[PDB]
Every structure is written in C-alpha cells, then in structure tokens.
C-alpha cells in the first residue's frame, strides 16, 4: 500500500488514453526530446498514452508515438525515459471520488505527484500537494 490509501479508479488499460488536466485544461504531453509538458492542442501527436499495470494500482505511462516512459527524477523533475526503470512507476489512485492522481512510487513517502500548472508546465515533485487542481487528471479515450 506504500502507506497510502487504496481507492482505485475504474476503467482498464486495454486502450490508449489522453491524460487531461483540469487545472489549465491540458493534455499530458511527452516530447521526443524527453521533455514533458501539457498542451491544449487535441491534435498533438505526442499526447496519446498507453498505461499498463505492473502490480495492482502501479502503472507505467508510455508514449505511443515515441515509446518513452513518463518518469520523475531524484530532484522531482518529470521526464521521458527511453527505458523503464524505478522512476517510471506511479501509484494510480482515485481522487475526490472522480479523478485520477499519479504519485511517484519511488518518492511516495514524500507525496510527489504528477501535475500540470495552469500555464501547461509540469510541476516539480515537492511543489505538488493533495488538494491542488494541478494533480487532477481525467483519462480520455483517444
């Protein structure tokens, strides 16, 4: 449980999705250069993601266009990794009985989440907190 609640979101990983952030109304984007951000452009070719489960509640978020894995570094910066490693795992949970939240597994004890600012920039791990809108995501069909 990693010392966290276990309310899981409904749905599956059968198909790819878009991870939509309410905060600024952005879709999670993994750039070929390893850069990660958010875009409002629904036609962007780098927003399609494939989630997969490691263990129950643990996921990988992979770019279908590039094959890169979403990850969060030692300093809390989100990046795109060519290969899957411990920094690529996230704890996917339901939040506010509706949204999906993604907590860095490696940094779970610190509550470091995946989050997008209103300007579409990713937030740094330590800057994320329960209660913010930046951490709330909606998985949409592609």
What does the model show?
It holds the Pfam family FGF. It comes from Homo sapiens (Human). Belongs to the heparin-binding growth factors family. GO terms for molecular function: fibroblast growth factor receptor binding; growth factor activity; heparin binding; integrin binding; S100 protein binding. By secondary structure, this protein is mainly β. Helices cover about 0% and strands about 35% of the residues. The chain contains no helices and ten strands. Strand 1 and strand 2 form a beta hairpin. It is globular and about 35 Å long.
How many β-strand stretches?
10
Q: What portion of residues is helical?
A: under 10%
Outline type: globular
CATH topology: Trefoil (Acidic Fibroblast Growth Factor, subunit A)
Determine the number of helices (DSSP H or I, runs of at least 4 residues): 0
Describe the largest sheet.
4 strands, antiparallel
| Tally of discrete structural domains | 1
Give the ordered list of helices and strands: EEEEEEEEEE
- Using only C-alpha atoms, the radius of gyration works out to 13 Å
Give me the CATH architecture, please: Trefoil
**Content of β-strand:** 35-45%
Q: End-to-end distance, in Å? A: 30 Å
Protein structure class: mainly beta
Q: How are the strands of the biggest sheet laid out side by side?
A: 3-2-1-10
CATH class: Mainly Beta
Region (Heparin-binding): 117-133
GO molecular function, one term: fibroblast growth factor receptor binding
Organism: Homo sapiens (Human)
Binding site for heparin: 23
